[PDB]
Amino acid sequence: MRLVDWIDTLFPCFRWIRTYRWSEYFKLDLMAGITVGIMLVPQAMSYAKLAGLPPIYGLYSSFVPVFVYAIFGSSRQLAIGPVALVSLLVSNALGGIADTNEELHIELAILLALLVGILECIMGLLRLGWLIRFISHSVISGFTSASAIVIGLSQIKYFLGYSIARSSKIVPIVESIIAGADKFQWPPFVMGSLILVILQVMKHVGKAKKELQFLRAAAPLTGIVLGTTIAKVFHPPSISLVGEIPQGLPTFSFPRSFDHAKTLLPTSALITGVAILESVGIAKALAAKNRYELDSNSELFGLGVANILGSLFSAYPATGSFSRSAVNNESEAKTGLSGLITGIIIGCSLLFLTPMFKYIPQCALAAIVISAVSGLVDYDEAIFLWRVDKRDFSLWTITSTITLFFGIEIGVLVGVGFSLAFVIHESANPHIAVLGRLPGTTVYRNIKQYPEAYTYNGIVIVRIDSPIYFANISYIKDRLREYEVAVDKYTNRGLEVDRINFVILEMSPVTHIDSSAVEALKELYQEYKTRDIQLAISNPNKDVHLTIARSGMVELVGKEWFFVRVHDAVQVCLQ
Amino acid sequence: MRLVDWIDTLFPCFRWIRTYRWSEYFKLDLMAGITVGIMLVPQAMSYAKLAGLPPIYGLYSSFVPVFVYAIFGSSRQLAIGPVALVSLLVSNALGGIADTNEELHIELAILLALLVGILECIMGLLRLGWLIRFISHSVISGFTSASAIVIGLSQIKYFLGYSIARSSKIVPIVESIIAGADKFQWPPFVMGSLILVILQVMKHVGKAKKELQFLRAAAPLTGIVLGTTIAKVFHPPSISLVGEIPQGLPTFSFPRSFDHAKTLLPTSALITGVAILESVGIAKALAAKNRYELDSNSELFGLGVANILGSLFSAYPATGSFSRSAVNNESEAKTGLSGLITGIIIGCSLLFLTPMFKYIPQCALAAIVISAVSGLVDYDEAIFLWRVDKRDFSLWTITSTITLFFGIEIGVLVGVGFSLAFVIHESANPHIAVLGRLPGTTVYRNIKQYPEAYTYNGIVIVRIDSPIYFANISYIKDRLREYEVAVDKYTNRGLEVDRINFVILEMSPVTHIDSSAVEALKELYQEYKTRDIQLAISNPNKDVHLTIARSGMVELVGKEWFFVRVHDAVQVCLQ
């Protein structure tokens, strides 16, 4: 194994190091990295506050994994760090375990990051990511919208100024807000409302214009730069600051709370599922847009390695960001260096900007989180689903409502269960076509023509428009037994009639068959002999023919009933 | 609603009452009922002993539900009562809950029967039985074989003569047997071995001959008639008798142990799943053999009603029997009256034969259970799978080994999970064909001919041989993006080359498309415009065309790129 291949195998970053056009790529990467870091620092602190951890642990979650991802990540525009959904899930798990320790929370979050990284590395090495991508996008969209509403209603407590009941359901949150309304304060609410209005106005102006689009990245910072100013001029009494923030880079430390690890598998999987469904999707979309190759397994392995190293350096789970990756995308980011620069910015903060961070009001961070999650309430997809596919709209509405009123875990379980139910329903109801004229197709909808001869009395030609395996064998057995039922009805009448003498199976679209398929075929052949019906096979696939010959069906039904076309099969059936 | 329709709707039994040919049907039904009752009484007591309940509760489980099933059951040959697998599952649940109460066991079993009946009625009314039939037959066969081995190794303790450790795993059972080998007794082992040998010889002789086939039904009784005789002549000291058995029909009593009901849902579902997979399968096979209609939903409703009434009359869950239903089948049973007569026989025992039952040795019942489950070790299917389908053989072996060494619940979970994994793998990897000549098909395997013109430079014709929905949309997106990757590779070379200008989709086999399909199609069209590739739709289905028009794809890509055939599409692409 030479170095040129071994290095590329272990370090995917070199995939863009060798093909690096310095002149334009360096300037574009530097600008994109600076922009993403500026957008990220306040967002990192706000998301850390959302998860229940002290704000500094957001910056850690952006420092070490980013440097790791830029070395082990396949995507060249994806931005790695805290996100709203993963922070919400981490907060959910920690609150379900620890109440007010403020010290077990940190260790639990770091252990959760380590478990998520290990699960991601396992699912990337084994290439088991396809086991999750069966979940419909409507379910994910509804769950994300409900999570966004829950996040906003949880963060409104900083605007109100009094602590509210901590829960993931809307009803207890609203009940607590109503109960505590007697402790309302005007200064924090006014500050939060003004900051949120300014942030949303800046974001809308940036998205409306094509050239003045950097405001989206400068919106989270500017609000703080605004809010702190009022905190340093008028000094409102009822506002709260983030307090002292430790200064310095995080140090190496193995997790010490493995005793709760078994409690964290249900969350560690869930977060990992998000990375399979959202982060990998963002990476693939960006790769398709930017004309480079990407695979869903190496990306998961890179995310897992980044999470593992972040856990080793006091970080909580970090995945791809819908907002930051986009902002990187229109910043003309070319390689993964834009990540490294971003990380460097974080490091600079951890060395120089922490003393100035203690004057940031908490309502400003709450407003930043609210602005970030306002774009996650994705009702446009709900309208689109209502217009196009009402089954998908029903799935979206059910998932959103259940996640809103019941827990996050209940909503996730309902969404996954409904997706599995619909997958099983589709697998268990294959399309079966009753063919008419020999070079023809389904008579019910496709072709109604009569080229002087369309169907033959006594012969039924059936095509199974799918591979036959254990999931759909029962439906096929029932459909083929309908002809026996028709024969029984004919023989049970008061007059002698029999219009089913031969049944021909078109197995040309049948890609493959398993043992259940040949067993059922033998059973139906025996039942047809009981009913005096002849079974024929028309267009066996090579693999299908080999399986049929191995199972002994050819000897049971006779070699003379196996053909290569429908024309000769029907011709010998008439004779 | 007239009586002729209402009565038939509520009471399916009348389906065979109206069409009843007295002369032959009465004699055949009477003989079949007597035969099944004779085979059932000892089997009922033996299975009740297997479940951990006192033997009499087997007879109850054959008395009231049978009379109910004959009124509410759709099958005319199915025999309802205790079975080996359901008894094993009931014993597993009870031992997991109650250790040696011998009184909470009865109430727990009756409550389990009520819960099973309610779940079956719910799944029959809602017609949700298709949610379970995706499980492969190999998984069920392996689980049943492992359960049979576990049942035999649990029942060998009566042969040994000393109590062994109660578990559902082979290793603790063998360890306990080795530990207790110092308490071995010769009389019970000799009695059990002789009874088992006689039973197996009788069963083999009955199955070998065509006319002397009643011995299979007389084997369980004869052994008792044998064993008791030695218990009444030589009186061995170390043998154990079933003891006093209460006399009389069971009385009405609602369950009183609802407090454990939530613990019993995981078992109540599992047993119900068995009824969906095994009992309904037996009913459908018998109906197909005997030339009458049967549906999988009314049968589940009848089983649920029978279970509910049995629970109301002190019975534990009862489903269809592989052995007794067969014995009914070659006994020329025609209607459901054969069930009623069988039940009557049970009633006679409960009125007259209970005093004579106290002399039955326990080793005789153990031998009966061992003989009953010896036929459930279904290695013939394992050999068949090894010969035909090695994936199914691997599933069978994994399920059997895990159920043998680990718990029943772990084996069930592994089997269901592997079946789901394979269903998802099949759904997520649809077949996509690269067509050659216009009235042609897949070029890789199907057709290699060259009718003077087969493929065109610059044009790729792709057919998706499946409906497009949320499960397989990712694979289709990747397959369609492979052409973009090829274009990128062509443009990244040292020479100017571009051999992908048009991509045509054959959507004739695409039965239907959902919202995810049209969203992905729009995304791929936009990416093709980025790569300067034209997207065309060749054979849209009527529903597919309607969905495409509703989603706005026709306006986005242009109406001029929608056709009805591949010939004209390629003709306009060349021009």
Author numbering:
A (entry chain B), B (entry chain A): 70 to 644
Show the paper's wording.
Higher plants have evolved a family of SO42− transporters, SULTRs, that mediate absorption of SO42− from the soil and its distribution to the entire organism. AtSULTR4;1 forms a homodimer and has a structural fold typical of the SLC26 family of anion transporters. We visualize the structure of AtSULTR4;1 with bound SO42− and demonstrate that AtSULTR4;1 is an H+/SO42− symporter. We show that H+ transport is likely mediated by a glutamate residue (Glu347) highly conserved among the plant SULTR family and that the cytosolic STAS domain modulates the transport process.
We determined the structure of AtSULTR4;1 at pH 6.0 in the presence of SO42− by cryo-electron microscopy (cryo-EM) to an overall resolution of 2.8 Å. The final model consists of residues 70–644. The STAS domains are swapped between the neighboring subunits. The SO42− is located between the N-termini of TM3 and TM10, and is coordinated by side-chain and backbone atoms entirely from the core domain. Sidechain hydroxyls of Tyr116 and Ser392 are within hydrogen bond distance to SO42−; and so are backbone amides of Ala153, Phe391, and Ser392. A conserved Arg393 from TM10 is ~5 Å away and although it does not make direct contact with the SO42−, it likely provides the positive electrostatic potential for the binding pocket. The helix dipoles of TM3 and TM10 are oriented with their positive ends pointing to the bound SO42−, providing the positive electrostatic potential to the bound SO42−. A negatively charged residue, Glu347 on TM8, is ~7 Å away from the bound SO42−. In the current structure of AtSULTR4;1, both the bound SO42− and the putative proton sensing site Glu347 are solvent accessible only from the intracellular side, and thus the current structure is in an inward-facing conformation. However, in our structure, the N-terminus (residues 1–69) is not resolved and we do not observe densities at the corresponding position on the STAS domain. Although most of the dimer interface is contributed by the interactions between the two STAS domains, the domain-swapped arrangement in dimerization leads to the interaction of each STAS domain with the core and gate domains of the neighboring subunit.
